[PDB]
Design a binder for this molecule. Sequence first.
Ligand SMILES: CC[C@@H](CS(=O)(=O)C(C)(C)C)N1C(=O)[C@@H](CC(=O)O)O[C@H](c2cccc(Cl)c2)[C@H]1c1ccc(Cl)cc1
Length: 93
Amino acid sequence: QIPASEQETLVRPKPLLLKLLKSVGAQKDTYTMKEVLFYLGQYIMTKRLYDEKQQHIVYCSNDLLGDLFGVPSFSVKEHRKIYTMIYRNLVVV
Ligand SMILES: CC[C@@H](CS(=O)(=O)C(C)(C)C)N1C(=O)[C@@H](CC(=O)O)O[C@H](c2cccc(Cl)c2)[C@H]1c1ccc(Cl)cc1
């Protein structure tokens, strides 16, 4: 469904997303989606919003991430929905 070429595309995070990304990676004017996905994923793991003991679901209602995605939780395996939530928070270059 999701082509690997999508990860090479260039995007610019809006202010709130950039704030989250900055807590795990260096600030950049333009990121590749691969970068956005890793930093977002790393943020989730270091803050333990995703416990591999809790069946693929990320709980973020007590985190800025929840404000960013507009949901209290989501599955790490439903990638299509994740992409859609992320794009609400960035502008394509
Ligand atoms: C927090 C879970 C995170 C850790 S990671 O693989 O990024 C890691 C930081 C370990 C490299 N993570 C995963 O564990 C796995 C889950 C799986 O096997 O499907 O891949 C996720 C993923 C990669 C690329 C695109 C998407 Cl939409 C999701 C990805 C992910 C990235 C970003 C969001 Cl918002 C949600 C999920």
